[PDB]
Amino acid sequence: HVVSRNAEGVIVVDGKAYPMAEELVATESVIQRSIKAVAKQIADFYRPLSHRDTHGGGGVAPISDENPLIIISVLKGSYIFTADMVRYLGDYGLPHVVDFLRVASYNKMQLLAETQFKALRGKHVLILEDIVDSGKTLRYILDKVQREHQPATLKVCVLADKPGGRRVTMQPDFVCLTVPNKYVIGYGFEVNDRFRCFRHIFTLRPGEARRYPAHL
Amino acid sequence: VHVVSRNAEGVIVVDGKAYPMAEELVATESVIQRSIKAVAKQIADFYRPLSHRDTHGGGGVAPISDENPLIIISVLKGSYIFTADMVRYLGDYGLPHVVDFLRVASQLLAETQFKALRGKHVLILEDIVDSGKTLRYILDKVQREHQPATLKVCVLADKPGGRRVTMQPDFVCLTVPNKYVIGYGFEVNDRFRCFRHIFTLRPGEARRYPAHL
Ligand SMILES: O=c1[nH]cnc2c(CN[C@@H](CO)CCP(=O)(O)O)c[nH]c12
Numbered sequence: 001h002v003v004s005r006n007a008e009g010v011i012v013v014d015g016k017a018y019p020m021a022e023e024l025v026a027t028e029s030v031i032q033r034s035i036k037a038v039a040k041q042i043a044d045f046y047r048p049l050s051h052r053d054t055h056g057g058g059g060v061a062p063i064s065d066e067n068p069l070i071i072i073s074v075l076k077g078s079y080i081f082t083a084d085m086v087r088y089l090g091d092y093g094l095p096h097v098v099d100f101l102r103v104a105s106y107n108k109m110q111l112l113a114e115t116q117f118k119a120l121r122g123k124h125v126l127i128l129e130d131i132v133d134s135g136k137t138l139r140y141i142l143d144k145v146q147r148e149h150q151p152a153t154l155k156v157c158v159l160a161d162k163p164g165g166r167r168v169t170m171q172p173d174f175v176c177l178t179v180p181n182k183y184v185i186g187y188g189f190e191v192n193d194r195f196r197c198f199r200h201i202f203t204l205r206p207g208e209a210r211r212y213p214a215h216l
Numbered sequence: 217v218h219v220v221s222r223n224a225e226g227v228i229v230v231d232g233k234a235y236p237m238a239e240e241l242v243a244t245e246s247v248i249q250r251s252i253k254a255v256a257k258q259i260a261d262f263y264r265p266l267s268h269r270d271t272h273g274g275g276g277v278a279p280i281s282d283e284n285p286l287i288i289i290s291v292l293k294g295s296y297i298f299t300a301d302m303v304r305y306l307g308d309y310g311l312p313h314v315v316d317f318l319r320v321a322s323q324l325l326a327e328t329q330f331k332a333l334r335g336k337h338v339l340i341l342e343d344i345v346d347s348g349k350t351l352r353y354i355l356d357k358v359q360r361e362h363q364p365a366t367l368k369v370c371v372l373a374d375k376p377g378g379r380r381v382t383m384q385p386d387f388v389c390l391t392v393p394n395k396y397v398i399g400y401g402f403e404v405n406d407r408f409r410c411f412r413h414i415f416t417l418r419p420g421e422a423r424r425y426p427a428h429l
């Protein structure tokens with residue numbers, strides 16, 4: 001990749017201008033290498049574990065295509081990250097299945113979309129989330145999944161950790177990238193759904209946060 | 217280049233990985249990605265000249281733009297990997313767009329959250345058209361509830377031999393054999409979605425994982 005600024009001071013990555021960006025955080029190559037390295041850590045961690053056997057009604061059995069790792073992906077920010085991560089988990093041979101939940105704030109938390117999996121009791125569950133910032137969203141999701149599904153173990157993998165944003169204790173078990181204490185965009189991160197399709201992650205110019213006020 | 221072979225057990229091996237649940241290979245990752253990117257170029261070429269209701273400036277009609285993007289509705293859970301790949305190609309070709317999701321199951325499980333689609337160009341992204349029944353259901357629902365200016369469909373896969381009702385998507389990335397496909401988003405009880413290639417499933421293996429997740 002080539003990262004530079006044009007004559008207007010605008011960041012250009014591979015010939016493409018990003019006038020909404022303050023700084024580049026990570027190119028696609030760095031992001032993908034970071035995700036694949038975490039996929040290897042996740043596969044190495046879960047491959048030797050056993051949990052409730054729901055395929056044979058038996059007691060306990062190794063993680064397998066019969067009894068896969070349960071992954072709950074948090075929409076919408078995690079969908080692109082999850083699509084890439086599952087393919088790397090497959091490269092490393094980790095048996096797994098994915099369902100989705102969505103949460104939002106009104107700030108207080110509320111579930112927008114429930115998972116449809118119904119047999120998570122005694123299973124290993126991994127949450128895939130886009131970013132840990134204040135820690136409030138993941139505190140809410142972990143408490144809810146833990147009490148409603150009663151999994152054997154519950155862990156979190158984030159694409160991004162913004163360390164300085166913490167207001168409640170939260171350190172995901174797996175972290176692909178560390179980002180600056182700024183609003184990030186690209187690769188699933190957005191402003192009113194814009195910028196999600198970027199292959200790179202950037203910080204946002206402060207004046208751009210209210211650029212698209214109209215609800216979709 | 218991909219290496220495709222069979223081991224002593226007669227099992228298909230792609231790049232050193234065995235697929236004992238597969239009958240035949242349909243498409244490698246390289247072929248799939250080339251086909252998605254080609255359709256992304258067609259979708260961007262078709263929509264970038266169009267105009268629709270202006271909700272950024274209130275009214276009236278304005279070009280597709282980051283202010284008034286193309287509205288994409290992705291069908292969960294089957295289309296999520298295809299969508300993640302397609303939106304990045306659409307970005308490559310400079311098509312302004314935003315994505316919302318609907319979830320269907322075999323009933324509507326999750327509704328769209330977008331509320332200002334009236335007079336907007338809307339594109340549905342779906343994994344496969346086989347019998348045509350799922351898309352006939354989604355199209356009627358989206359038209360009635362959102363009143364879009366235009367409603368089109370892009371599928372990763374068309375199985376033309378499976379039709380039971382009339383359904384011709386506007387954009388088609390790949391044609392598949394009249395067989396149950398697995399891989400690249402396609403699954404048996406959520407298994408096989410993460411494969412980078414599309415295969416046909418060995419007969420009778422659709423019952424391999426009977427327990428509900
Ligand atoms: O930097 C960012 N870029 C784009 N969006 C966000 C958000 C909001 N989203 C949720 C997680 O989806 C916050 C998790 P928390 O409660 O831990 O703050 C915080 N920071 C950013």
Ligand SMILES: O=c1[nH]cnc2c(CN[C@@H](CO)CCP(=O)(O)O)c[nH]c12
Nearest residue numbers: 294344345346347348349350396397402
């Ligand atoms: O070949 C296949 N492999 C994996 N799954 C399927 C499905 C079921 N899914 C829906 C849409 O996701 C079918 C669309 P339709 O209503 O037109 O029949 C049909 N064929 C296959």
